[PDB]
Amino acid sequence: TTSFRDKKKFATVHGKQMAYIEEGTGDPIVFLHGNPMSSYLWRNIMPHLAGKGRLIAPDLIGMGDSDKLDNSGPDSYTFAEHCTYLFALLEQLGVTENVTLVIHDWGSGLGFHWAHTHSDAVKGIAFMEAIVETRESWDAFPERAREMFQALRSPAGEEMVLEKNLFVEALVPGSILRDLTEEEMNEYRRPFANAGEDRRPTLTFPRQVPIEGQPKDVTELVDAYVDWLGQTSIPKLFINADPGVLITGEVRDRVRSWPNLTEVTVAGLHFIQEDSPDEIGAAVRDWHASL
Ligand SMILES: [Cl-]
Numbered sequence: 104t105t106s107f108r109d110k111k112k113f114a115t116v117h118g119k120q121m122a123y124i125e126e127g128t129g130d131p132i133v134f135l136h137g138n139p140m141s142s143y144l145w146r147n148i149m150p151h152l153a154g155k156g157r158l159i160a161p162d163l164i165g166m167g168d169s170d171k172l173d174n175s176g177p178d179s180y181t182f183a184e185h186c187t188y189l190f191a192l193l194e195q196l197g198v199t200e201n202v203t204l205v206i207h208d209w210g211s212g213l214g215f216h217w218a219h220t221h222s223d224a225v226k227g228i229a230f231m232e233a234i235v236e237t238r239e240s241w242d243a244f245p246e247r248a249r250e251m252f253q254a255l256r257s258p259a260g261e262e263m264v265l266e267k268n269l270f271v272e273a274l275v276p277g278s279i280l281r282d283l284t285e286e287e288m289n290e291y292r293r294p295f296a297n298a299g300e301d302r303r304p305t306l307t308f309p310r311q312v313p314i315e316g317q318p319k320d321v322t323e324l325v326d327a328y329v330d331w332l333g334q335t336s337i338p339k340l341f342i343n344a345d346p347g348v349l350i351t352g353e354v355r356d357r358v359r360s361w362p363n364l365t366e367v368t369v370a371g372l373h374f375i376q377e378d379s380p381d382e383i384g385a386a387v388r389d390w391h392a393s394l
Pocket residue numbers: 138308309310312
């Protein structure tokens with residue numbers, strides 16, 4: 104049988120190898136994962152778009168089968184650095200026009216920021232469990248994740264992630280309704296199997312979430328793209344999750360005010376691709392076909 108790792112192509116980006124799935128021809132349909140996942144997150148959704156365009160699912164730097172950075176430490180794998188690598192990869196792959204984005208979690212921070220700064224290049228944005236606000240208070244943070252994220256953002260974070268791999272080992276199964284199979288879980292573990300800095304991307308990401316204005320750079324760029332999303336006529340497909348995690352309550356009401364928006368609801372907590380892949384794939388296919 105052909106494994107997932109086996110299907111990947113590779114590009115040299117600032118001297119580092121970045122892995123990605125690419126299949127088909129036509130305008131790009133770009134699938135962006137977040138933390139602590141990889142292109143594997145899209146494996147059951149991509150077949151619903153087969154023959155509809157050029158499907159591209161990159162592994163972010165330090166994740167999936169992409170290279171790890173050199174002398175990784177607490178300043179490594181920030182949002183800015185992820186932009187540097189991903190945006191360069193996208194340019195190298197000729198993702199420049201008529202782009203459909205299918206985005207989740209930190210992949211949505213990256214994708215929304217890309218769309219905002221390449222606003223004439225975008226055919227449509229499908230998003231789910233996405234970065235769609237900055238939080239003025241920890242009170243606004245998801246109840247089920249607050250203790251975990253407060254501890255990750257503290258000095259405790261290195262031991263929790265670099266040693267104990269808790270983003271993978273606790274947050275992943277906690278954020279899926281079903282149980283992943285052993286094979287599926289082992290594929291998420293694989294890029295992070297080695298203790299130490301190999302796991303750093305999964306710790307810098309929670310430290311980059313904009314809460315009480317910190318970090319400042321991420322807060323500003325998210326605020327900027329959220330303002331723009333409330334105005335732009337670019338078609339939007341909001342895949343709402345029931346119950347969801349990141350997009351719930353008041354946040355969800357605000358998303359529903361965005362222009363040119365189609366909404367579908369599917370079962371899921373946060374990694375909803377694992378609970379409702381066929382519902383998500385069919386929704387993306389049908390919406391993309393209507394554009
Ligand atoms: Cl995170």
